[PDB]
Design a protein around this ligand. Sequence first.
Ligand SMILES: *[C@@H]1O[C@H](CO)[C@@H](O)[C@H](O)[C@H]1NC(C)=O
Ligand SMILES: *[C@@H]1O[C@H](CO)[C@@H](O)[C@H](O)[C@H]1NC(C)=O
Ligand SMILES: *[C@@H]1O[C@H](CO)[C@@H](O)[C@H](O)[C@H]1NC(C)=O
Lengths: 29, 476
Amino acid sequence: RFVFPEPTADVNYIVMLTCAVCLVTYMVM
Amino acid sequence: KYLKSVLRELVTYLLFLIVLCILTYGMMSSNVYYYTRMMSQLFLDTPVSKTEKTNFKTLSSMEDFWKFTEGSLLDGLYWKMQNRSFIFYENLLLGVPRIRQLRVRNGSCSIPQDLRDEIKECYDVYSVSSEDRAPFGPRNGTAWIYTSEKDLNGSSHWGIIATYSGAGYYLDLSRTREETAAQVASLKKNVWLDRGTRATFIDFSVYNANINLFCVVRLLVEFPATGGVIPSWQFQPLKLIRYVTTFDFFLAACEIIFCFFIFYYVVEEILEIRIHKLHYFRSFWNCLDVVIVVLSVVAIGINIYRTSNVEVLLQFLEDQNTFPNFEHLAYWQIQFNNIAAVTVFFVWIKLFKFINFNRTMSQLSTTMSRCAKDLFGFAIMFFIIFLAYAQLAYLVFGTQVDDFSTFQECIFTQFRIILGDINFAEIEEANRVLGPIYFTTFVFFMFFILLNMFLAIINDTYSEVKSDLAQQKAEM
Ligand SMILES: *[C@@H]1O[C@H](CO)[C@@H](O)[C@H](O)[C@H]1NC(C)=O
Ligand SMILES: *[C@@H]1O[C@H](CO)[C@@H](O)[C@H](O)[C@H]1NC(C)=O
Ligand SMILES: *[C@@H]1O[C@H](CO)[C@@H](O)[C@H](O)[C@H]1NC(C)=O
């Protein structure tokens, strides 16, 4: 009931942008 | 004091600089240039056939590749001696060249059912999870059977479109043209470059026994899923049999002295960090030493990893009728050069600490240092607008210009425009509404206004510094 996919290398920019925004706002705040 | 303590601290740096300069002059000679130049011009600057003018450098179709592989390639590998095959009657073609193919499988993507009457198959872009592994065509030899990455001793390549693996369908070529041409014809008849192929590699190496410099040659051809051909090449002058002449022992001795010097510096830095002031990072003169020592120790580690790893040469020398695997050595040589070239830069930069021997240099250094605290803010505010323009250009023109086809390419294009090299003669064709507007706004706001604050700040800082240092004489 678990899997280590690692299928491809095409990154998904949505998660990266969300995390970057959430850390930048924390830094400035 | 401040004089009897610095004199040793200066001569120890001068000897370090001398040793580093000896090393740099040692590794880079003036014979590698012409070697690589003729080697490149032999394969890249010659047409595939006398009836056309399309060289390997400007391939444009799947068909042109077949014309190349039997043509200017075979004509530049096998030279009849007036059996061995000397390229320029000096270069020795050691081993045999190897060709390799990377391809994807049928039905690798999905198509909608409403138009699944005309689209019979799709070949998705290259991916490790979509790479074919089944035997296709006539199942005779290694050219129609998949082979794992560890069974070829290969590795990744990082091409232009993607990062290709070391696996694929490979084939070893003969030593005489008479059989290599037959093998290539056999590959071409039973279709081997199908619609599913995505990458092709050709590898070999030469010796050129006069000087002691191996030269490894790799040629990549990439087939994007949207159609087209993208060529790439790499010629690397390795050296693996160093110890022959006295200069080689000289270089080894200088390397040993360099290791001793870096050990001395790291010891005197640990002693200073631990047995003296802690958290002494507000100097920029000690944050430079750590960078230098880290880069040097990385270079030494890479050298120990690579130089001690030469058994592949011994294996090739056992039997010399098999493809030599020198790909890793070239990669590590490139990485070592990319580290040494930055290490020498910082070593040269560090010299600025030692030039304060009179009033003029001291005041120039004071002006340059005091002007860095406030230029930092404007640099950030300027780079923010720079990246704003970069992303705007990438989003708008980054689909039809090909100078803005990538973010870093956009940055380089903007810097070139700043130098005054690129003209917008193609941007109007790319776009007529937002083209001239963007060009005019960028060349006006960031070349008439933003770029002069840098002059203003420096001019004001220098003026106030000189005035203060002149007033420093009205009190004395
Ligand atoms: C590729 O796959 C399709 C359906 O997945 C099928 O027509 C056949 O196996 C292949 N296409 C051709 C033209 O052979
Ligand atoms: C493949 O093998 C068959 C029989 O083993 C042989 O006749 C043929 O020449 C080989 N090569 C091909 C089909 O290219
Ligand atoms: C890969 O390395 C092994 C290790 O000895 C060697 O025997 C072999 O010839 C090399 N090449 C291939 C294609 O397996």
